Design a protein around this ligand. Structure first.
Ligand SMILES: Nc1ncnc2c1ncn2[C@@H]1O[C@H](COP(=O)(O)OP(=O)(O)O)[C@@H](O)[C@H]1O
Ligand code: SF4
Ligand code: SF4
Ligand SMILES: [Mg+2]
Lengths: 57, 416, 62, 194
RNA sequence: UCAAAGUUUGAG
RNA sequence: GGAAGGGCACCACCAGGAGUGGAGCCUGCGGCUUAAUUUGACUCAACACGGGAAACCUCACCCGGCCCGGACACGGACAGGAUUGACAGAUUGAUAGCUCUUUCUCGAUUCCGUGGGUGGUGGUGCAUGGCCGUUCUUAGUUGGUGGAGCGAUUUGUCUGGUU
RNA sequence: CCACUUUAAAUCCUUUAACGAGGAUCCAUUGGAGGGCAAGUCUGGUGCCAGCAGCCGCGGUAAUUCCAGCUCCAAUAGCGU
RNA sequence: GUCUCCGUAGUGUAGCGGUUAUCACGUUCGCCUAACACGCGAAAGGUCCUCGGUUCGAAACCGGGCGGAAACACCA
């Protein structure tokens, strides 16, 4: 029992949006550089009860 | 009366439309159906324990709603003292509607047809799948269970299983123990055994015919003992009745218990029949296209233009159209018109500016077409034939021609 | 919110300010002649009555 | 396993004169689907035999009978050697020339026999029902066709045709017979052939 | 110095 | 726990009292009924409870009609005065200028957008605070430091007498 | 892309003239971001539906688990199944 | 066809010419229970199959009606 109906119910009705235009992201090695720089050399601050890389209050 | 019956069907269809829409936030709704034979006490008890259970429901808004509905469905049942014939259908709950208006409702009624489909539910919504499935299946089929012992004549809806009339007989013994008399007694036995068949074949006319036309779309004969056949293929059984002999079914058992067996062995055929008749009708529709003739039509524009005028004979429609009749209206001038819009053209359309004057021509709400036909096909030309997309001729009608058209009462030329 | 068709809404007023309103006439350039009657306490012209615009006083000659 | 072809005689269709008729009469088109596309402008009435039912109504209506719809075995949609247009004739497979052998073609006419012969002469590229050469050869592997066409493309095989209509040779070639054989000589075996 | 005492929303 | 020990409470019993359940009424629920009969609370721990004895008010409910008490901004709107407030007489329930006909008016109020407010006895106590009530009127409850356990934990908080 | 070289004859590399980059470009993907397990209690839609989820689970109207946007993480001419 | 018997609250049955028509179950309404069941107390409910007769009086006795069920249908 139960119909095979609603199927694509949600995916259908969601509010479609464009995916913006930001930038060519740096690739290969350069990407890796930039990553390395932002873990170790730029910040290295005084600590305040642990970190977060995608945290947002 | 026929007209009063058609009003009661329309009433119930409208009731279903509302109950399917209803809905209520939080809460549940007592779906309920009490079949004809049942004892209502039995239902009262069931409810009372369903009450007691519901009092341990953890959610409040659901709980208190369900308890309320069960309290009130019990009170409805108190007003009846025997189960009404043709069953009972109760529908309690606390439906929500526009204006943020939480409203309680308790719809009970004997439905016009007998029905054989009990049901109890609490759920967020009401359940009317039973009811629609008893308006759809009109198709009454006649059953006759012949046996050496005796007969049984009975009618049959989708689920409902009626017993019209019956009898049994003391037929003679198989053998005659004198050498000469053996032959005479045999000939005599053949005469009383046949006479029984003659009686059955008359009684079936007496029961399953009405005003020189059989009331049953089939006529299943059943039994054992090469008897049902003796009826089936006799000159005594009336040819208009025997035209609609639909099955000879070899059942074990006889009589009432014989009945059910005869139905379960019949199930496959009574499904095919509804498709067979459909194939036949559309087959003729196509014949008029195949030969030049002229007496067919298709596509709303043409078909309704044919209906409006010197009408169609038969109007054929796929049982769900999407297609819908809208009533358009002007703000200033008060000029109005109506149009038959497709699912794509009805949903969003910049066409409906008034243009000549120069205003936004507002589309006042619709009435979906198939229903529009069902309302007022009688005020035209008649025989509204609902069809399907199961048969090859059915699908070709639905896919190609648009599931709409009709066989016309005479030749008509169309233009543009 | 299904509003009834014959009931419908009820529109409110729209005034009509007809430019600079004239209550006066020029008699021999220097002197002036007033058209409409003034208050005792322009008590304007109705079709029969003489209605005030402020102190709500009312008069008519039968 | 049965599909439909629609065919439009480019001579008998004159979409300006008749003012449509097919558009109006076709149920698919009244259904609201691009089954036929015509307009008063634009030569030759188009049909999506894809969306066509094959009702056989448009065939009756058209005032010159320009529209011919037929069925055809679903098998044959694979093996389609040439189709010149939309709603045109549709050859299926080719003959299989083998060298050292006279290939006898047989069958009634108006059945792509000239299209076969053009293709095999190499003047016509068998479009393969597309409307290419490396894609063509690959379609003819395992079969003497690929050797045939490959042989054509590197050494230009000279295609020579004895035609059907013999009485449109007169209105072209002048002079005596004996002169004309001498002009076209290459084998240098006139006397033996004569 | 031993009578009877069965069951428990699917609705989180 | 329809397992054993102790030990206790008239929201437990015993002994008794006065009763309630019976009647008429008063009032609260639930039902039915209804335009509406607003709603919360249903074992103790809902039901003369909401300090709820509602004529109106209260009031939420329904059936009617007024009103803005729509701040501020950015603008459009700025004077050929944007467009707040008005005895008639018809209408209205109404001595609501609410509307139609007509008056004339603060004179910088306005109206329209958008942002955005604001209110609401609207929904959600199963989103929360606070406050109650109940567990639970009984004698119960906790960590420190030591000891016991791989540990969850335990001991202290205990055989006994006592209250 | 001229020309050598290559080579049986070529191609390819290689060498080599001449043109040949502002990132709108010569545009890096594949998987995930509740736990195992690196990484959002972000913002929209859905409302035990659709769906995700190897396992534990998420979804019944504030979803860190769905469908989307944003960000973030892993590996990277590769990465899933 | 014959002869026999039986037709009584919702169900199954008692009923000796003067009965409030008996018993059991079921139903309804209280309690008991958190709820239900069990249990306890209450209550309602017979067209005595139908019609006619006898009788001071018939649910029964007697007649015919409509229903329903057993036994017989053998010797060639
Ligand atoms: N160049 C062309 N363009 C359009 N249609 C063509 C062309 N050549 C032939 N046809 C169509 O193909 C049909 C059959 O021609 P063809 O196949 O050449 O003859 P056969 O069948 O004898 O080989 C004709 O009716 C004609 O309309
Ligand atoms: S054949 Fe019948 S269906 Fe196919 S196109 Fe011509 S008309 Fe439309
Ligand atoms: S097909 Fe027949 S009808 Fe349709 S356009 Fe060409 S000619 Fe006119
Ligand atoms: Mg993980």
């Amino acid at each position: 029992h139960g119909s095979l109906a609603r199927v694509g119910k949600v995916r259908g009705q969601t509010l479609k949006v464009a995916k913006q235009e930001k930038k060519k992201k740096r690739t290969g090695r350069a990407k890796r550089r930039m990553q390395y720089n932002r873990r170790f050399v730029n910040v290295v601050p005084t600590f305040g009860k642990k970190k977060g890389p995608n945290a947002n209050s | 009366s026929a007209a009063d019956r058609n009003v009661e069907i329309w009433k119930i269809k409208k009731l279903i439309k509302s109950l399917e829409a209803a809905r209520g936030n939080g809460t549940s709704m007592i779906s309920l159906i009490i079949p004809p034979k049942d004892q209502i006490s039995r239902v009262a008890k069931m409810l009372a324990d369903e009450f007691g259970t519901a009092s341990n429901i953890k959610s409040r808004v659901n709980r208190l709603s369900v308890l309320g509905a069960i309290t009130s469905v019990q009170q409805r049942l108190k007003l009846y003292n025997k189960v009404p014939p043709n069953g009972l259908v109760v529908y309690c709950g606390t439906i929500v509607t526009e204006e943020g208006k939480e409203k309680k409702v308790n719809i009970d009624f004997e439905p016009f047809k007998p029905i054989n489909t009990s049901l109890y539910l609490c759920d967020n919504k009401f359940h009317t799948e039973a009811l629609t499935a008893l308006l759809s299946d009109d198709s009454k089929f006649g059953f006759i269970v012949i046996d050496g012992s005796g007969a049984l004549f009975g009618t049959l809806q989708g689920n409902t299983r009626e017993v019209l009339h019956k009898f049994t007989v003391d037929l003679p013994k198989k053998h005659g123990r004198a050498a000469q008399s053996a032959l005479r007694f045999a000939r005599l036995r053949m005469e009383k055994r046949h006479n029984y068949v003659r009686k059955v074949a008359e009684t079936a006319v007496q029961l399953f015919i009405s005003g020189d036309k059989v009331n049953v779309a089939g006529l299943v004969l059943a039994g054992s003992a090469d008897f049902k056949t003796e009826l089936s293929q006799s000159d005594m059984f009336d040819q208009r009745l025997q035209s609609k002999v639909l099955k000879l079914v070899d059942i074990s058992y006889g009589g009432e218990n014989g009945f059910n067996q005869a139905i379960e062995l019949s199930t496959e055929v009574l499904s095919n029949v509804k498709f067979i008749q459909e194939k036949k009708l559309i087959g003729r529709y196509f014949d008029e296209i195949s030969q030049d003739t002229g007496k067919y039509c298709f596509g709303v524009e043409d078909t309704l233009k044919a209906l409006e005028m010197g009408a169609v004979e038969i109007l054929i429609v796929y049982e769900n159209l999407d297609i819908m009749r809208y009533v358009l209206h002007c703000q200033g001038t008060e000029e109005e018109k109506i149009l038959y819009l497709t699912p794509e053209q009805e949903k969003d359309k910049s066409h409906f500016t008034d243009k000549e004057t120069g205003q936004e021509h507002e589309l006042i709400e619709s009435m979906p077409l198939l229903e529009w036909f069902a309302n007022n096909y009688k005020k035209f030309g008649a025989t509204l034939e609902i069809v399907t997309d199961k048969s090859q001729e059915g699908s070709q009608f639905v896919k190609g021609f648009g599931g709409i058209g009709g066989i016309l009462r005479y030749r008509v030329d169309f233009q543009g | 919110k299904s509003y009834t068709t014959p009931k419908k809404n009820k529109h409110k007023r729209k005034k009509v300010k007809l430019a600079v309103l004239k209550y006066y006439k020029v008699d021999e350039n220097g002197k002036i002649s007033r058209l409409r009657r003034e208050c005792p306490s322009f008590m304007a012209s109705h079709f029969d009555r003489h209605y005030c615009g402020k102190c709500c006083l009312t008069y008519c000659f039968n | 396993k049965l599909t439909r072809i629609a065919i439009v005689n480019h001579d008998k269709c004159k979409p300006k004169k008749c003012r449509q008729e097919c558009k109006k009469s076709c149920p698919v088109v009244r259904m609201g689907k691009l089954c036929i596309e015509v307009t008063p402008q634009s030569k030759i009435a188009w049909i999506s035999e894809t969306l066509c039912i094959g009702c056989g109504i448009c065939i009756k209506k058209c005032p010159f009978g320009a529209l011919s719809i037929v069925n055809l075995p679903s098998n044959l949609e694979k093996e389609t050697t040439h189709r010149y247009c939309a709603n045109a004739f549709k050859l299926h497979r080719l003959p299989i020339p083998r060298p050292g052998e006279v290939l006898g073609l047989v069958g009634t006419n108006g059945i792509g026999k000239s299209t076969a012969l053009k293709i095999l002469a190499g003047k016509q590229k068998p479009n393969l029902g597309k409307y290419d050469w490396q894609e063509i050869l690959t379609y003819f592997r395992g079969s003497e066709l690929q050797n045939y066409f490959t042989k054509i493309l590197e050494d230009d095989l000279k295609a020579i045709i004895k035609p059907q209509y013999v009485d449109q040779i007169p209105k072209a070639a002048k002079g005596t017979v004996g002169s004309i054989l001498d002009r076209k000589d290459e084998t240098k075996t006139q006397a033996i052939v004569c």
